[PDB]
Amino acid sequence: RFSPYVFNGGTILAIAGEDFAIVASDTRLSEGFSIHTRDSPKCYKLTDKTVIGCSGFHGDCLTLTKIIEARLKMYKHSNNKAMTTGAIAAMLSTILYSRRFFPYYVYNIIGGLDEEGKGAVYSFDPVGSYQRDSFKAGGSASAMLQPLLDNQVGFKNMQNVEHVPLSLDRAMRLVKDVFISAAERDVYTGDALRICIVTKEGIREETVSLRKD
Amino acid sequence: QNPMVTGTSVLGVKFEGGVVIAADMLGSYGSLARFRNISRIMRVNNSTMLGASGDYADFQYLKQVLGQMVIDEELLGDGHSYSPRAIHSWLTRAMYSRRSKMNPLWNTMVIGGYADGESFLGYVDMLGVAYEAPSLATGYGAYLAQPLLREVLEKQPVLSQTEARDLVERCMRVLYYRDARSYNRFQIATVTEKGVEIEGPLSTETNWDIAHMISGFE
Amino acid sequence: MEYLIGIQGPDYVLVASDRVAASNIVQMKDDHDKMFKMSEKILLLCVGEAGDTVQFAEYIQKNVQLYKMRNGYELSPTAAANFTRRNLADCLRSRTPYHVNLLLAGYDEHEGPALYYMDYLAALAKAPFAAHGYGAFLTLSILDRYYTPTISRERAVELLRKCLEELQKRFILNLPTFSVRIIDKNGIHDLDNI
Amino acid sequence: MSIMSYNGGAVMAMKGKNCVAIAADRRFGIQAQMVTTDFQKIFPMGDRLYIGLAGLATDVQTVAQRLKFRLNLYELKEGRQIKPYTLMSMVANLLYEKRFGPYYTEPVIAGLDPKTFKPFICSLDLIGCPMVTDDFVVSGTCAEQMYGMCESLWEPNMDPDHLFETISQAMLNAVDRDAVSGMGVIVHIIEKDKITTRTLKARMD
Amino acid sequence: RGVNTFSPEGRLFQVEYAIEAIKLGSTAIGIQTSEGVCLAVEKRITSPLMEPSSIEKIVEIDAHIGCAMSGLIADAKTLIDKARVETQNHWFTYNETMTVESVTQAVSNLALQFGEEDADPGAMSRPFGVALLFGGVDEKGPQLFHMDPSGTFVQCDARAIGSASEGAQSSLQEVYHKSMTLKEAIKSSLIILKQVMEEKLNATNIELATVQPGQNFHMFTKEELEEVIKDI
Amino acid sequence: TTTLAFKFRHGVIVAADSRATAGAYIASQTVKKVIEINPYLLGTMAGGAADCSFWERLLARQCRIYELRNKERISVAAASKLLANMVYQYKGMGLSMGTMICGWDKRGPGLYYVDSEGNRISGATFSVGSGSVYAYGVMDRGYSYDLEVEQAYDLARRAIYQATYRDAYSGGAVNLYHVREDGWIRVSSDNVADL
Amino acid sequence: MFRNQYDNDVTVWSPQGRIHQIEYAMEAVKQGSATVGLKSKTHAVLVALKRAQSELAAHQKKILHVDNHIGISIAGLTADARLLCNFMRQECLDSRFVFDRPLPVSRLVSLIGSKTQIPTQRYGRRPYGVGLLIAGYDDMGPHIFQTCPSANYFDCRAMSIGARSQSARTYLERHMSEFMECNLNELVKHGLRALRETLPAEQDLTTKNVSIGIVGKDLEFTIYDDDDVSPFL
Amino acid sequence: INRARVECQSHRLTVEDPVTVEYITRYIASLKQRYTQSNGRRPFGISALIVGFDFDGTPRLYQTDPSGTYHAWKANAIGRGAK
Amino acid sequence: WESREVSTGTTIMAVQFDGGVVLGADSRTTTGSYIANRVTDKLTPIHDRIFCCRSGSAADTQAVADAVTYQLGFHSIELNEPPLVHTAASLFKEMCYRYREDLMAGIIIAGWDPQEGGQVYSVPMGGMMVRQSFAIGGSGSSYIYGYVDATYREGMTKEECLQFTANALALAMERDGSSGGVIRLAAIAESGVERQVLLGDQIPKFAVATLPPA
Structure with missing residues (x-):
């Protein structure tokens, strides 16, 4: 019969500061050898300095997003008080644990800022589960990019001589550099790159285009 | 669910003054031409147009629910409210639920229209993936025709040079020649900003050298 | 693995029951026994699926004690066996999988003891002795040969001893020997093993 | 083997004049392992x-x-x-x-009505169709053979003493047919004045 | 004669009756001060062969919200089971703290089920006959609410409810101040509690509790109560 | 992943490892594979990451009801029994979940082994893992009820190190706990790579 | 007589065909607080009085944020109002999920009405005895409606609930023409004056009881609470 | 009685020991107030004396009454001619 | 379908004319060389103006036909005068759709009313409802397609149409299939409903085969 599983995911990269975060993503979305669309990110601004991205399938991605947004509205109505990141982190999991019967899935990540004046990023598995991050790349191209990303951004491996502390500017240079490189190693990366930069002033977006061939 | 009597190749585009849509008129049952000269055109309201491809039985079923939408409420039910961005969402939800039962439909539909200032052209599939793009083609047309259309519609100033019908007319001739699971007749419909217009029964035009090189009959 | 032997002397019943306590693919501990004492008049041994055994046993214990208090009487162990059999008979048909083998060892106050063997097709029988599992193969020839209807008490203890020496000898399994129980109308005692 | 065969078994009934007879096997094992020769x-x-x-x-x-x-x-x-x-x-x-489920049973009825004084036998099928028996009745897995013997051995008029020989030999032939070693058999001989029960002597392993 | 009636006055009958039932119970006192909430109660006694040691009527809902209840005591036992669970459910879902007020709302929804009519979905024929003084501490600091048997909640800083309430509340005013010491308060509370009594002042019929941020919800022990007696 | 627990003179030593995930070599750890049921009780992840997370949390709520209503501490034996029933419902819907629930109660030091069939057996040494077998050889040599605290931390520690060669989803770091009658005290987390 | 008869039948009909139940319901609206509603039809304001039972209390709210473009004031008992409010919020949520449209508040109000009306049309249901002034900023502007527990839905350009509603009505009619399609400031002053008419008027104006709530062209739901009204005083 | 006899057994399985007396009492009490507060039911209206021990030698006397409440006493007498 | 399957040629058409519609169809159903059913009707009155041709599996079609009759019977008594067009078509569709893929019906519903004239609707297996100028159905269509393409007749006479259907059906059965026997026909007009029957020996040696209908 008809499929109960179709791929569509891209590639994303979430980078955590200690007072900022950026979540960057390709616009190219593909499956296999035919191209679904040459545009659209899977990173979205949930608001209030929470940025979210759901990689796996477009059909699932829109639906989760819409649905979360009502639970936040309802909550505030129920008495003035808002979900923290952590709250949201539990909320996604329950949904997934339900969906363990459902045959379509997604690999979700949430990022934002705490009131500890630093980033928190939590990442979920497609069955439920959560873990604390420092940095996460998600999607297809992730597996290849990440050790190198971990080392260049991090310096927390047992295979580097020194540390340096993050800078925003420096984080931006690294991010573009990884993506431009990713593109001639995948057909799931390409076209353009959408950067969500998260600060305590508010949420800014930057776009730069990449190669295609 | 499973194909029965099916239709393929529904092409569409957006242009300055409107959106243009074209579709052949065929109901094939594998390869037997059960129906020749069959519509695929549902006017929605008068200011939006749905072109549908996929199972023809399923199409009929969907037309009625759409029909209920405007014969209800104090004022018309697709009057003051219900914009094309809304009509697109409403449709997507309906595929989504079927797929969740895994008792699915089998159509790919284009909802085309005008909003009030902006062109609306939005896609829905059996997969249920929803997008807006300036150019769409279904079926065989999705693979073959859409790169020919894309040269014109990925270059935005060149769009602005002309009313689109000619690109459409041309593509459809190449399409009829290469594929004989397609029929010589087609209908073309244009939704302008305030009006809607259907040009009825046309047949493909006979090219110069291309006619010698390749014919449309088996 | 799974094994249970029994013999009914006309004055007591000795049963051999399984032991484990750290059994996965290794031996490092064995102390726990898949038996529950149904009361002090009836004792029950069981083998089958490991989760299902505890789930089944507890329901039957719970009910039997209610009837005891409500009537202020005690059911015969024979009476108990058909009851247990009737429950297991339902289950088999249903979607839930209880298909475990049970041994109800019982002492009748003024009718003398009785030993019941339950299969996973659901079948209840009384035997002066029987056995089941891997143990049975080796033991039953001895039991047939050495036992003679209404043998002494002293003779049983020797006969059980022989089994352990056969099990050692021929060599089977990977954990050593059995746990033996004595059921009497003085309650339940224990026959130590090497 | 089957859903009826794990402990096998066969059952016979024969009619006499002024009397009827039902004979059966006994044995219960667990699969192919014989524990007891009763049931x-x-x-x-x-x-x-x-x-x-x-x-x-x-x-x-x-x-x-x-x-x-x-x-x-x-x-x-x-x-x-x-x-x-x-x-x-x-x-x-x-x-x-029971026909939807896996309980499939073959019954056989036998008796002599003594408030009407006529003999009565029937067999019934495991899809539920009743078929009224005459003169001989068969049941068990061995049935094809058993049928063969019953068509041969019978003679139109029978006395309890002749009827006794007929069933006994039938029963004797029948135990050799078992691969499940179903050893031990009972006979009940029914009259509208008396019933005799006989357990019979037969092969032992 | 329905009790599904709205009433010609339009003021439902059953709610009014409840206040009378309450006038029959004990006296329960609350002062919330600048820092800390105190709740004091009379758990009473009558005979010498009774153990009120056993009895209580001030319970901790959780370690940061408490409640004192007053009225038809059996109903309040039902009332708490529902609340206590609901709070606990929020910890499973977000592992986080609930506001005193959120908890109080949840229970008020359940206050309306009386009737078998079609304004209320039936389960009950009548309401809970109790008022509760709901206390807690959070980031909105120590606060106090008065849960009204009229299925509604009003906010408070000082309140008495009980038989004596009409007098008590008057007495409560002079001693209240927007800023007063917590310890000072406990003595002030003790004075009103003394006045109402006809029966002996012992630590075996009155009970104090407070919540302070530095030590959670704490029930006050006998030895502690006896000391408070000595001061006044 | 190997986690192990053993009983001795006073208390339990509970040890497990963790590592960051990507399906390749790393040394950073991520999160815990031990679940804090209550400030008293520890339960180990030796089943699926989510199954444990959800179900252990649920058992934990029931403890918080039970303690508040009845006015007492909950028994570790009781807590195993409650878990087992629930585990049994989930049976015939696949999934994995196994744990060891460790405690030092009034009724004794107790370790219950729990699996994904819903079998529940009480014990005093358990090693669960892939590496469990290897760990076991090391445990067995050192096994005594006459063992002192310092030495026990080392018993466990070395046991993990042996596991690192054998399985690549062991190692990274080992977290150790010693459980007392006023809660657990962590012996702390020790990097596998050292000696 | 037969007062008890007319309570006992919720299917009541009398010789004069009156339905007493509605009557009772009206007395219950008059028992509530004082609230006014006003609109220019480019801005809408509502002055609402929030009162407190005693000295050591603090005022209870009667302005509810139903949505970030629609809202109400309640006048009558707090408990029933909560129940209605959940239904309406969820009705707004599915509008957002499915249709992604706000939806006319006019269309919304009418739907809620039916579902109540039908249980008065049969056994069970007592009156809900809260009246509402419902405001919202929709596509064709703000609009104002009065919902009654008689399910009497009316759009008005201003209205009032509370004992001595009529007083303030007469002033609203007088000042009606002055309201025009401008000035924020002016609407509030008239409201403060008007609100004085609703009260017995022996009670002097206070900043702790009053509360001012606005929605307008670029405005959504905002509340001025306590002292916060003094800037705009 | 029946409700209690099953209930002890429910507990016997979970707690793996018999519980306190007070706990048993609380269940019976709960049904009685439950029947007043719920529609379409009413309590039996009976009053009891509940007494026992647990593992401890402390003796327990608790009193149950159909006002839906329960309490401890040193001594108690109930019924005709109580004063 | 339930427990049959047809593997033989079917040949049915309704052809429209001025006065109304004329229906023709073969008789007998067959599964293989063994004769599943002998010479039978499927030209069914479910109304006096409204007839149908049944095709596919016998059991399914029979069930559908009575069910529509019940509904139209209730509808007729109270609204009064039934036209074929929207009203017959939908009731057959819903069932085909609902019962979905456990349903094998190929129906030509043809009717004559003075209300809009005669109509022809064709139920395919998907249950599309299509107004046709005239329609040919069955598996034997494949044999007739060529004839109709060749002849290019136009203009209708009751007599002219009778020959047209007679050669087409006759041929179709001849090459393949094991369906045959009698060809039965109904010309439906304001006169009433006229029944024609033609024997399987009187039905060969015809010609003519319209395709433009005007």
Whole structure:
């Protein structure tokens, strides 16, 4: 019969500061050898300095997003008080644990800022589960990019001589550099790159285009 | 669910003054031409147009629910409210639920229209993936025709040079020649900003050298 | 693995029951026994699926004690066996999988003891002795040969001893020997093993 | 092997003039491993009416108890006896319900009505269709062979003493047919003045 | 004669009756001060062969919200089971703290089920006959609410409810101040509690509790109560 | 992943490892594979990451009801029994979940082994893992009820190190706990790579 | 007589065909607080009085944020109002999920009405005895409606609930023409004056009881609470 | 009585020991107030004396009454001619 | 479908004319060389103006036909005068759709009313409802397609149409299939409903085969 599983995911990269975060993503979305669309990110601004991205399938991605947004509205109505990141982190999991019967899935990540004046990023598995991050790349191209990303951004491996502390500017240079490189190693990366930069002033977006061939 | 009597190749585009849509008129049952000269055109309201491809039985079923939408409420039910961005969402939800039962439909539909200032052209599939793009083609047309259309519609100033019908007319001739699971007749419909217009029964035009090189009959 | 032997002397019943306590693919501990004492008049041994055994046993214990208090009487162990059999008979048909083998060892106050063997097709029988599992193969020839209807008490203890020496000898399994129980109308005692 | 065969078993009934006879096997093992050479698969409901059941043992116990419930209550309400025919019907109705499920049983009814003084036998099928037997009745897995023997051995007129020889030899032939070693058999010899029960002597392993 | 009636006055009958039932119970006192909430109660006694040691009527809902209840005591036992669970459910879902007020709302929804009519979905024929003084501490600091048997909640800083309430509340005013010491308060509370009594002042019929941020919800022990007696 | 627990003179030593995930070599750890049921009780992840997370949390709520209503501490034996029933419902819907629930109660030091069939057996040494077998050889040599605290931390520690060669989803770091009658005290987390 | 008869039948009909139940319901609206509603039809304001039972209390709210473009004031008992409010929020949520449209508040109000009306049309349901002034900023502007527990839905350009509603009405009619399609400031002053008419008027104006709530062209739901009204005083 | 006899057994399985007396009492009490507060039911209206021990030698006397409440006493007398 | 399957040629058409519609169809159903059913009707009155041709599996079609009759019977007594067009078509569709893929019906519903004239609707297996100028159905269509393409007749006479259907059906059965026997026909007009029957020996040696209908 008809499929109960179709791929569509891209590639994303979430980078955590200690007072900022950026979540960057390709616009190219593909499956296999035919191209679904040459545009659209899977990173979205949930608001209030929470940025979210759901990689796996477009059909699932829109639906989760819409649905979360009502639970936040309802909550505030129920008495003035808002979900923290952590709250949201539990909320996604329950949904997934339900969906363990459902045959379509997604690999979700949430990022934002705490009131500890630093980033928190939590990442979920497609069955439920959560873990604390420092940095996460998600999607297809992730597996290849990440050790190198971990080392260049991090310096927390047992295979580097020194540390340096993050800078925003420096984080931006690294991010573009990884993506431009990713593109001639995948057909799931390409076209353009959408950067969500998260600060305590508010949420800014930057776009730069990449190669295609 | 499973194909029965099916239709393929529904092409569409957006242009300055409107959106243009074209579709052949065929109901094939594998390869037997059960129906020749069959519509695929549902006017929605008068200011939006749905072109549908996929199972023809399923199409009929969907037309009625759409029909209920405007014969209800104090004022018309697709009057003051219900914009094309809304009509697109409403449709997507309906595929989504079927797929969740895994008792699915089998159509790919284009909802085309005008909003009030902006062109609306939005896609829905059996997969249920929803997008807006300036150019769409279904079926065989999705693979073959859409790169020919894309040269014109990925270059935005060149769009602005002309009313689109000619690109459409041309593509459809190449399409009829290469594929004989397609029929010589087609209908073309244009939704302008305030009006809607259907040009009825046309047949493909006979090219110069291309006619010698390749014919449309088996 | 799974094994249970029994013999009914006309004055007591000795049963051999399984032991484990750290059994996965290794031996490092064995102390726990898949038996529950149904009361002090009836004792029950069981083998089958490991989760299902505890789930089944507890329901039957719970009910039997209610009837005891409500009537202020005690059911015969024979009476108990058909009851247990009737429950297991339902289950088999249903979607839930209880298909475990049970041994109800019982002492009748003024009718003398009785030993019941339950299969996973659901079948209840009384035997002066029987056995089941891997143990049975080796033991039953001895039991047939050495036992003679209404043998002494002293003779049983020797006969059980022989089994352990056969099990050692021929060599089977990977954990050593059995746990033996004595059921009497003085309650339940224990026959130590090497 | 089958859903009725794990402990095998066969059952025979033969009719005589002025008497009827039901013979059966006994044996219960667990699969192919013989534990005991006993297990009645025939029960009676009132002196003279005998019912022999041939499914799996598990099924048999449950069905015999069902027939008890029904019959007792029925008997009570009408306040007068049940007939042989009435038992036959009852079995059918029960047989019909079990047809979706894996309880498949073959019954056989035998008895001699002594408030009417006629002999009565029937066999019933495991899809629930009743088929009224005559002169001989078969049940068990061995049936094809058993049928062969019953068509041969019978003679139109029979005396309990002749009837006894006929069943005995039938039973003797029948135990050799078992691959499940179903050793031990009973006979009940019924008259409308007497019943004899005989356990018979046979091969032992 | 329905009790599904709205009433010609339009002021439902059953709610009014409840206040009377309450006038029959004890006296329960609350002062919330600048820092800390105190709740004091009379758990009473009558005979010498009774153990009120056993009895209580001030319970901790959780370690940061408490409640004192007053009225038809059996109903309040039902009332708490529902609340206590609901709070606990929020910890499973977000592992986080609930506001005193959120908890109080949840229970008020359940206050309306009386009737078998179609304004209320039936389960009950009548309401809970109790008022509760709901206390807690959170980031909105120590606060106090008065849960009104009229299925509604009003906010408070000082309140008495009980038989004596009409007098008590008057007495409560002079001693209240927007800023007063917590310890000072406990003595002030003790004075009103003394006045109402006809029966002996012992630590075996009155009970104090407070919540302070530095030590959670704490029930006050006998030895502690006896000391408070000595001061006044 | 190997986690192990053993009983001795006073208390239990509970040890497990963790590592960051990507399906390749790393040394950073991520999160815990021990669940804090209550400030008293520890339960180990030796089943699926989510199954444990959800179900252990649920058992934990029931403890918080039970303690508040009845006015007492909950028994570790009781807590195993409650878990087992629930585990049994989930049976016939696949999934994995196994744990060891460790405690030092009034009724004794107790370790219950729990699996994904819903079998529940009480014990005093358990090693669960892939590496469990290897760990076991090391445990067995050192096994005594006459063992002192310092030495025990080392018993466990070395046991893990042996596991690192054998399985690549062991190692990274080992977290150790010693459980007392006023809660657990962590012996702390020790990097596998050292000696 | 037969007062008890007319309570006992919720299916009541009398010789004069009156339905007493509605009557009772009206007395219950008059028992509530004082609230006014006003709109210019480019801005809408509502002055609402929030009162407190005693000295050591603090005022209870009667302005509810139903949505970030629609809202109400309640006048009558707090408990019933909560129940209605959940239904309406969820009705707004599915509009957002499915249709992604706000939806006319006019269309919304009418739907809620039916579902109540039908249980008065049969056994069970007592009156809900809260009246509402419902405001919202929709596509064709703000609009104002009065919902009654008689399910009497009316759009008005201003209205009032509370004992001595009529007083303030007469002033609203007088000042009606002055309201025009401008000035924020002016609407509030008239409201403060008007609100004085609703009260017995022996009670002097206070900043702790009053509360001012606005929605307008680029405005959504905002509340001025306590002292916060003094800037705009 | 029946409700209690099953209930002890429910507990016997979970707690693996018999519980306190007070706990048993609380269940019976709960049904009685439950029947007043719920529609379409009413309590039996009976009063009891509940007494026992647990593992401890402390003796327990608790009193149950159909006002839906329960309490401890040193001594108690109930019924005709109580004063 | 339930427990049949047809593997033989079917040949049915309704052809429209001025006065109304004329229906023709073969008789007998067959599964293989063994004769599943002998010479039978499927030209069914479910109304006096409204007839149908049944095709596919016998059991399914029979069930559908009575069910529509019940509904139209209730509808007729109270609204009064039934036209074929929207009203017959939908009731057959819903069932085909609902019962979905456990349903094998190929129906030509043809009717004559003075209300809009005669109509022809064709139920395919998907249950599309299509107004046709005239329609040919069955598996034997494949044999007739060529004839109709060749002849290019136009203009209708009751007599002219009778020959047209007679050669087409006759041929179709001849090459393949094991369906045959009698060809039965109904010309439906304001006169009433006229029944024609033609024997399987009187039905060969015809010609003519319209395709433009005007």
